[PDB]
Amino acid sequence: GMTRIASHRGGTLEFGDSTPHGFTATAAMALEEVEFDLHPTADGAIVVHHDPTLDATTDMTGAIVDMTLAKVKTATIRYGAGSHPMTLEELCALYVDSHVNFRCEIKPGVDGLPYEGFVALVIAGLERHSMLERTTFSSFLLASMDELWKATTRPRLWLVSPSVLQQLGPGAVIETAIAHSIHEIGVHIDTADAGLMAQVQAAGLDFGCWAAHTPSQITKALDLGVKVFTTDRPTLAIALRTEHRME
Ligand SMILES: [Fe+3]
Numbered sequence: 001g002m003t004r005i006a007s008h009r010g011g012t013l014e015f016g017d018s019t020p021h022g023f024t025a026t027a028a029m030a031l032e033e034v035e036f037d038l039h040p041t042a043d044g045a046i047v048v049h050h051d052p053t054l055d056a057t058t059d060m061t062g063a064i065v066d067m068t069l070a071k072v073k074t075a076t077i078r079y080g081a082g083s084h085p086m087t088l089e090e091l092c093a094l095y096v097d098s099h100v101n102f103r104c105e106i107k108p109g110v111d112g113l114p115y116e117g118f119v120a121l122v123i124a125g126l127e128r129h130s131m132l133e134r135t136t137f138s139s140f141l142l143a144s145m146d147e148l149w150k151a152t153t154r155p156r157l158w159l160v161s162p163s164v165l166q167q168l169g170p171g172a173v174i175e176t177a178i179a180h181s182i183h184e185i186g187v188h189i190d191t192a193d194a195g196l197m198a199q200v201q202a203a204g205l206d207f208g209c210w211a212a213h214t215p216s217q218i219t220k221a222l223d224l225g226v227k228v229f230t231t232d233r234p235t236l237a238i239a240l241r242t243e244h245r246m247e
Helices: 020-027 069-074 086-095 118-128 142-151 162-179 194-202 215-224 232-247
Strands: 004-009 033-040 046-048 103-104 136-141 154-161 184-188 207-211 228-231
Touching: 004 232, 020 033, 020 086, 033 086, 033 118, 046 086, 046 118, 086 118, 103 118, 118 142, 136 142, 142 154, 154 162, 154 207, 162 184, 162 194, 194 207, 215 228, 215 232, 228 232
Parallel strands: 004 033, 004 228, 033 103, 103 136, 136 154, 154 184, 184 207, 207 228
Antiparallel strands: 033 046
């Protein structure tokens, strides 16, 4: 078939991290998914932002869950020409009329523990704005995968970090997925190879990748024939795939 392309945070290295501009630009592009992360605010809002704090990519400091949607909207995103962080409702508006689908990540808080009651709130929100039926859900945490398995019929994918992959080893990663009724894993592109993909598929699991940001990495994913990869350079990915097909 054809390896799908997911725009990492709207295309971080083209448009900045999680910017209205990058999401808008991604919404009009010739790829299949946009990838993004969500966190709650202290007053029940759902904001699109990678880290659980605002420090790294904005001019404001603090944990998103400790602050109001008001304060979060006062923050300005680095390299985002004046942009503020998006709510989920706002993000949904840009994609309702687009052909590109959602790949949502359930990230934990600053303490690394999952947000209590949030998976439900995200599922409600997406249903309320007519995108749930176009969302694939992802997380590094089995606690979050387990909540998703119980709360939704949408596709679920487990993000397997290099540490987990190396330490558990592929055998145990596969056993753990199967034990949790997880039908797809995503590994860091630098930890992927043909043998690993063989082993994963032989167990009945889909195999995708993440962090394919360079020409080398992007080409590796296409040559390997993975199901999907996230990329901070979606423009180049599309161009490299189009050219890979023909070659
Ligand atoms: Fe993510």
